[PDB]
Amino acid sequence: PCQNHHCKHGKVCELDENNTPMCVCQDPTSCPAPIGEFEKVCSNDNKTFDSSCHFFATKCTLEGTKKGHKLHLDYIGPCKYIPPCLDSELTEFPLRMRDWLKNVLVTLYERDEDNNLLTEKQKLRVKKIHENEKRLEAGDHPVELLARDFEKNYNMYIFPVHWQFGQLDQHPIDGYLSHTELAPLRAPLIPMEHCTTRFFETCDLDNDKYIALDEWAGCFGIKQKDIDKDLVI
C-alpha cells in the first residue's frame, strides 16, 4: 500500500500505526551498493559517499538542523582534488558556460525524436535557434568571440539561459538553485567547472546561498526585462 506513495529524496514509505503511508528517512544501508566510482558522490565536506542514495539517506536525518541545511552534494563521483579557480578563468567563465548552454540545447533538439527530450513549445524555441544562419557554431572559441556573439546574438541566449535553470530547479521546484541543484554544473563536461562554485557565489547577490531566477539570469547577462518564468517550466 505504499507503491503509489513517492517520498522525496532521502526518505521511503513505511506504514504508521493506522496502516497509513508515512515518509521516514531511508536506511543508508538499504541503498543499492555503487557499481563503480562513477556512482559515488562527494559532499561539500569532502566526504565521498557511496551513492547519492546513501548521501541523501544520511543527510535526511539532519532536516531542520543548521548542519543539515549546509550539508550538500558538491558533485557526483568520488571526492577529487579540485584546482583553484584562477581569477582569470572566473571572468571568462560566464561566457564559456553560456555558450555551453546554447550548444547543449541545440544538440538536444537534434537528438530529440517525438519529444522524448524537448517538449513541443521547447522544441519550437530551440528550432528557431538551431536553423539561424547567424547562430555561432560550436567549438573552442576565444572569450573575445564568445563575447561579441553574445551582444550580436543576445536573443539566442535568453531561452537556453532560462531552460538550464528549469532543468536544475528540481530539489524541490521552488525557483531557487541550492548548492546541491548546481551539482550537474560541476561535472567535467562544463567549461572550467572548477569555477562553478566560485562563480555562483558571485551570482548569489543577497547571499542566501541560493541562486534565484533573477540572480541566475542576471548573472548570465540576460536583461532583467527579458526574464520570463514561462520559459522555465
Ligand X SMILES: *[C@@H]1O[C@H](CO)[C@@H](O[C@@H]2O[C@H](CO)[C@@H](O)[C@H](O)[C@H]2NC(C)=O)[C@H](O)[C@H]1NC(C)=O
The binding site for Ca(2+) comprises 204, 206, 208, 210, 215
Please select the residue that binds a copy of itself; options are 14, 39, 112, 214, rule is CB under 8 A: 14
For residues 223 and 233, what is the distance between their CA atoms, to the nearest angstrom? 19
Residue nearer to ligand X on the CB measure, 7 or 79 = 79
Residue nearer to ligand X on the CB measure, 81 or 224 = 81
3-state DSSP assignment of residue 114 = coil
* φ/ψ (deg, to 5) at 80: -105, 165
Residue 176 near which of ligand X, Ca ion, a copy of itself, none (CB within 5-8 Å, type-dependent) = Ca ion
The answer to whether residues 34 and 40 touch, using CB atoms and an 8 Å cutoff, is yes
Task: Report which residue's Cβ sits closest to ligand X.
Answer: 81
Residue 68 near which of ligand X, Ca ion, a copy of itself, none (CB within 5-8 Å, type-dependent) = a copy of itself
Alpha carbon separation from 182 to 20, 32, 72, 211, 216 (Å, rounded): 35, 24, 10, 9, 11
Q: Which DSSP string do the residues of 191-224 spell out, in sequence order?
A: TTGGGHHHHHHHH-TT-SS-EEHHHHHHHTT--G
Please select the residue that binds Ca ion; options are 16, 27, 37, 174, rule is CB under 5 A: 174
193-222: which residues touch Ca ion (CB under 5 A)?
204, 206, 208, 210
Binding residues for a copy of itself, rule: CB under 8 A, are 14-17, 19, 22, 24-27, 58, 60-69
